[PDB]
Every structure is written in structure tokens, then in C-alpha cells.
Design a protein around this ligand. Structure first.
Ligand SMILES: [Cl-]
Length: 200
């Protein structure tokens, strides 16, 4: 796997109504699955956390659970997202980020592990200010943030600002974007680049 290190990885999966059910089924859920496939989930390597967010954040994989540390068990849970009322609602990225900060506050995370947030999103947050504020508070706790943008509703400048890059210029290893139909071709190289940054 291109991601293989002691990393607590918080997958924040946008489930907003802007996605459209057919994209959710054919692309978003398969994208999360392929993302997970880039990770060595193990007690001594990556531990996964996952939430979905639209109106609010909802945890779907508990950090350090069996599914957090085993890829087959993680993939069953992601696949279970198909048989739901998703997608729907707005884009409450700040509440999704807040849940990660609650893990840190509460000392749930491995203190020894690098802390990485990976956001999958097709839009702009409800509150750019609340999002960038949470993100700062995460950054102060040593958290790195990566963003994978999808489709025409994103704002690339905001995404790049979020991950700590210049909004337009220069290489940004913590950011990538893709058209809906192309996401599974962009995810592997993105996760390779992100994991290289996290390690360096
Ligand atoms: Cl928000």
C-alpha cells in the first residue's frame, strides 16, 4: 500500500444533496472504497476513522475499532452506505472537523501517530469561516489536512487554503481534484502524494 505508517486517518466524506444519488452509488461510495484500499490498516500502521457529513457529521467507523484496523471490515461499512437515504442536505464541514478535534481533546488518538484528515467533497462549506477556524485548531494540534475535490461545485482556492497551500500557485501535494467519472483514476496518486507528505 502507498500509505503505510503509524497514522490515525480521519476520512470525512461529504454526503450532501448536491452529489446526486447516481454519483453517490456509482462513484462516491466506490471512491471511499478505493481510498481505503490505498491504506495498510493494521494495529501497528494506519487506524481509520470515518464520518459522513451534510447537515451534520455522523460517525460511521470508530477510531481503533476492529473496522478501523482491518480493510475487509472497513469496506463492509462503507458499502453499507448504499442502502441508506443518502445523499442529502447541506455541507457542514466545520462539524465534521469538530468531531476530529473532539478525538484529540479527549485523547482518543494515538499520541505517537501522525494525524491526518482526508476530506472527500463536491462543494463549498456552509461556513468558510467556521471551517478554516476548526482547521487552524487542528493544525495547532499537529493535524495535517488533505482534500480531494470532485466536480464543478468545488472552490479550488478554498480547498488549497484549507490544506495550507497557496490558493493557486505551486505544487500542492495535499490537494487533488477530479470530474465525477474519473475519480477512481485520481485517488491512488493523490493518496501516494498525501502519505509522502505526512511522512516527511
Ligand atoms: Cl461548515
Amino acid at each position: 500500500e502507498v500509505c503505510n505508517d503509524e497514522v490515525d486517518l480521519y476520512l470525512l466524506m461529504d454526503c450532501s444533496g448536491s452529489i446526486r444519488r447516481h454519483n453517490w452509488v456509482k462513484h462516491a461510495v466506490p471512491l471511499a472504497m478505493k481510498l481505503i484500499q490505498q491504506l495498510n490498516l493494521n494495529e501497528n500502521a494506519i487506524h481509520l476513522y470515518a464520518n459522513i457529513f451534510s447537515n451534520n457529521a455522523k460517525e460511521i467507523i470508530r477510531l481503533h475499532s476492529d473496522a478501523s484496523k482491518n480493510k475487509e471490515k472497513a469496506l463492509i461499512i462503507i458499502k453499507s452506505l448504499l442502502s441508506t437515504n443518502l445523499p442529502y442536505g447541506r455541507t457542514n464541514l466545520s462539524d465534521a472537523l469538530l468531531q476530529v478535534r473532539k478525538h484529540l481533546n479527549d485523547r482518543i488518538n494515538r499520541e505517537n501517530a501522525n494525524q491526518l484528515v482526508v476530506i472527500l467533497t463536491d462543494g463549498i462549506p456552509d461556513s468558510i469561516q467556521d471551517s478554516l477556524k476548526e482547521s487552524r485548531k487542528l493544525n495547532d494540534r499537529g493535524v495535517k489536512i488533505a482534500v480531494f475535490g470532485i466536480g464543478q461545485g468545488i472552490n479550488v482556492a478554498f480547498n488549497r487554503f484549507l490544506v495550507g497551500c497557496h490558493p493557486s500557485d505551486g505544487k500542492c501535494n495535499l490537494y487533488a481534484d477530479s470530474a465525477w467519472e474519473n475519480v477512481k483514476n485520481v485517488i491512488g496518486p493523490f493518496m501516494k502524494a498525501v502519505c509522502v507528505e505526512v511522512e516527511k
